[PDB]
């Protein structure tokens, strides 16, 4: 069902009819529309019973690292830097006798992970409020709706 979600979102994007665009600084309307569609789709997923979303919310784009995070605002430079950045069966059968690249899949996945983090933050803002939004930003401490998210399907850790 994970690849099901991937294909569903990619089909929705193709309906939108779009790395190149991210570096395409002047394409602000496109970026706003795509992030709008993505936020609506994530709202649909995390809330299967609530599909309605803010159909007109303000947007903005940042371009400098001082305007970068280490009305929706986006860190265009960093995201551009990112986008630019079984045996037995097959042996048994060896004796029995519009394309998307894998790196593009990685890019789309990183985009989705960043956007779902941003949408989690946005949801925190909407329900808990602006202050507890800032608290979540300062402290990011899943499954409680959340099952509709592919993030809960994989875990990443750190070690010194």
């Amino acid at each position: 069902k994970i690849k099901l979600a991937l294909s569903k979102y990619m089909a929705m994007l193709s309906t939108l009819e779009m790395l190149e665009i991210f570096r395409n600084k002047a394409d602000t309307r496109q970026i706003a529309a795509v992030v709008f569609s993505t936020l609506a789709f994530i709202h649909n997923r995390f809330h299967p019973l609530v599909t309605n979303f803010t159909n007109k919310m303000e947007f903005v784009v940042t371009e400098t690292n001082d305007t970068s995070i280490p009305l929706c605002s986006v860190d265009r430079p960093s995201i551009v830097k990112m986008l630019s950045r079984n045996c037995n069966v097959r042996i048994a059968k060896t004796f029995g006798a519009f394309s998307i690249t894998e790196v593009e899949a990685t890019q789309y996945l990183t985009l989705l992970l960043t956007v779902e983090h941003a949408y989690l933050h946005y949801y925190i803002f909407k329900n808990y409020g602006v202050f507890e939004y800032c608290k979540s930003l300062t402290d990011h401490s899943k499954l409680r709706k959340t099952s509709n998210l592919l993030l809960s399907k994989f875990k990443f850790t750190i070690e010194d």
Binding site: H117, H140, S141, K142, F156
Partner: peptide, 17 residues
């Protein structure tokens, strides 16, 4: 770049299901 102390644990919370 920002000369900023990093929080491994906050990132883990971002990616701790």
């Amino acid at each position: 770049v920002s000369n900023c102390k990093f929080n491994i644990e906050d990132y883990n919370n971002i990616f701790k299901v």
